């Protein structure tokens with residue numbers, strides 16, 4: 137009575153992932169091998185991740201990419217969820233580098249192009265891995281990189297940041313070990329930069345047995361560059377490994393970089409006179425700023441906002457000391473306007489209030505959602521400035 | 523049907539909206555002088571008007587509204603135009619729109635280009651706001667020039683019907699009689715008055731013999747707000763057009779013997795609204811606008 | 823088809839020999855595969871009620887952690903209810919997962935992403951002034967403003983319709 141799920145005979149354990157256990161399986165007829173991630177339903181209830189697991193399934197089920205592990209089927213049973221995925225025999229890239237050492241320039245580049253194509257494909261689909269590392273990069277029989285273990289991933293949403301320090305410290309971006317907010321592609325790029333360093337040098341750029349020293353090295357953005365490294369790829373690493381996320385390389389920047397372009401396969405990536413309209417203005421400029429700022433104390437300014445929202449007869453739910461969700465009833469259309477508020481810090485004294493439009497899933501509605509948002513904000517801004 | 527009429531039926535308004543664009547909206551309580559200044563600041567020739575009282579988009583504030591205010595309330599260069607400074611967009615819209623009440627109607631992004639071109643012609647408008655009916659947000663301001671540039675890029679690839687190889691004279695495209703035009707010495711105020719009476723896009727500037735030496739358009743008028751010279755309209759249109767003589771382009775023209783395709787190529791390449799039809803001596807025979815051509819193309 | 827639905831039977835503990843007997847096999851002894859203290863078989867069962875029991879190193883026993891049923895003869899068996907909503911993946915994830923009126927730490931450090939303002943960015947002189955750069959998704963729906971002047975406030979926010987972006991400016995008297 138061997139263990140069998142949908143004609144696949146389950147074999148040895150391949151490993152344990154972020155959530156659940158992963159075992160190999162072999163088709164009883166064809167002998168086709170698969171990797172089966174096993175999620176105990178009671179366990180994903182204990183940890184309250186059922187939503188994370190549901191989104192992971194919904195999005196990863198549509199993914200088709202050469203260098204991302206494919207999800208073939210999700211089999212639900214009364215006690216358990218079986219995610220049947222493609223199987224690769226090469227094992228971890230990490231183990232490969234351990235046994236064979238560093239890879240030469242051409243092989244490091246080939247694998248890096250494959251991985252970055254997958255990292256890009258995810259971002260195009262609004263998904264952010266955040267666990268990227270050689271341990272989660274799998275090799276197939278032919279040495280093709282395969283991304284796996286989306287357990288720590290998340291989904292990018294318009295106007296939304298993500299705060300969850302994730303992944304191994306060595307592969308984590310400075311803002312991630314610092315526990316700050318991020319859009320999330322800049323983190324995957326930092327991780328991909330560390331992967332590139334590991335392929336080229338056979339070691340890790342930020343590593344130490346003293347954890348404070350490690351975190352300092354990461355936040356300083358300082359790492360050793362071996363003499364045998366190509367100056368071209370060194371500039372690439374320096375750009376991907378920028379501490380400042382605003383100065384850090386994007387995937388566009390990497391695709392334009394000369395070292396990356398060299399020998400790049402085509403399948404990896406799917407892709408004087410003044411204007412008449414601008415003539416009257418020239419014959420003839422204010423600087424925009426975000427929300428509203430104050431040098432007063434964060435307790436004083438957070439209290440004032442609550443007072444002012446009440447003055448305007450607005451309905452608001454408190455989430456955090458610095459996070460509010462506000463609703464207004466439209467006096468004409470009798471529908472509702474929704475906006476969220478968050479206080480941030482700028483410098484020692486300066487703090488900032490941020491206004492963000494909350495979309496409605498409601499049926500066609502009268503008035504302009506965009507303008508009603510503006511009007512709602514202006515009422516409060518008037519009070520706060522006065 | 524034809525190559526063009528079927529094409530405009532196929533595509534949706536949404537297909538012409540830029541990947542990322544800027545849209546300026548004025549509250550109707552905004553001081554009307556500030557509103558025209560804002561149009562210059564943003565490089566925008568017309569903007570949606572939003573009424574906070576009725577919680578709806580009312581209409582468009584265009585350069586035509588600036589021309590009307592000037593001609594109506596301009597007294598002389600010795601006294602300020604009080605109404606221009608004091609009025610609000612709504613206050614003047616009531617005075618100007620008191621005689622005739624027309625409710626501006628938006629075009630859905632899911633509607634076709636044939637709907638849009640039909641709406642521009644039927645309402646005799648140059649500015650058609652595209653508004654999403656679900657959200658109620660105004661999306662994009664659609665113009666004759668945007669649509670014709672779209673057709674130029676797309677139809678050149680395909681076969682074109684026999685109508686395109688016909689000469690301008692044969693097709694009878696444009697206005698060949700009662701051409702409203704001014705003289706090199708005509709005062710701006712007078713030219714504004716002609717805009718108000720004839721409701722034309724632009725006025726050819728002609729010499730002694732009727733030969734076009736320049737053109738004064740409705741667009742050119744906005745330069746008065748740019749330089750803040752609006753309070754003296756006594757100057758000639760020549761003095762008004764000195765601002766653009768630094769890089770001067772000879773007024774564009776076309777002939778009756780030229781084909782509609784030749785003319786449309788000249789329009790899109792120059793990115794201009796109309797061409798002055800002239801004879802051998804540059805004397806003004808007629809005017810071919812974008813609205814003329816888009817009416818010719820929307821009808822079989 | 824609808825009568826073959828995979829059901830997992832798992833015994834947690836040690837043993838040399840572990841068997842599974844139930845109403846579904848006529849209480850015959852089915853050997854379970856061992857995986858380092860976990861013993862398992864997977865069976866296709868009809869939708870409905872099934873009763874089962876384990877034979878562990880010579881001792882007939884139920885699973886205390888799973889549901890049981892006791893007969894009038896003093897027999898204690900495990901019981902399992904096979905339901906369709908167990909085999910529909912998103913139906914299972916739905917059943918697994920189970921104010922605003924005003925009643926009245928340090929502030930998060932501001933992400934520098936939000937300091938890149940789409941309207942401060944310069945566009946080429948040869949391009950339509952209405953055209954804009956393509957925004958970072960993270961700044962969408964956020965409110966930017968100009969310092970109130972001449973009693974007029976200027977607000978703007980970038981939104982996203984299908985694959986297109988529209989930055990809307992509003993001039994309001996205040």
Ligand SMILES: Cc1ccc(Oc2nc3cc(-c4ccc5c(ccn5C)c4)c(Cl)cc3[nH]2)cc1C(=O)NO
Pocket residue numbers: 139146147148152155156157159174175176179216830832855856857860861862864
């Ligand atoms: C700790 C833990 C405890 C229980 C758990 O839930 C489940 N474990 C399972 C193991 C198996 C299984 C699969 C193949 C097997 C065995 C025997 C031989 N082979 C060849 C057991 C099955 Cl078919 C369902 C399971 N559900 C999951 C976890 C977990 O999260 N990772 O361990």
Ligand SMILES: Nc1ncnc2c1ncn2[C@@H]1O[C@H](COP(=O)(O)O)[C@@H](O)[C@H]1O
Pocket residue numbers: 648696697700701702703721722723724725726795796809810811812813814
């Ligand atoms: N200066 C002008 N004099 C007379 N008719 C004109 C003039 N400019 C444009 N038109 C006509 O006015 C109509 C609308 O064109 P437009 O105002 O250019 O959109 C068309 O029939 C044009 O031929």
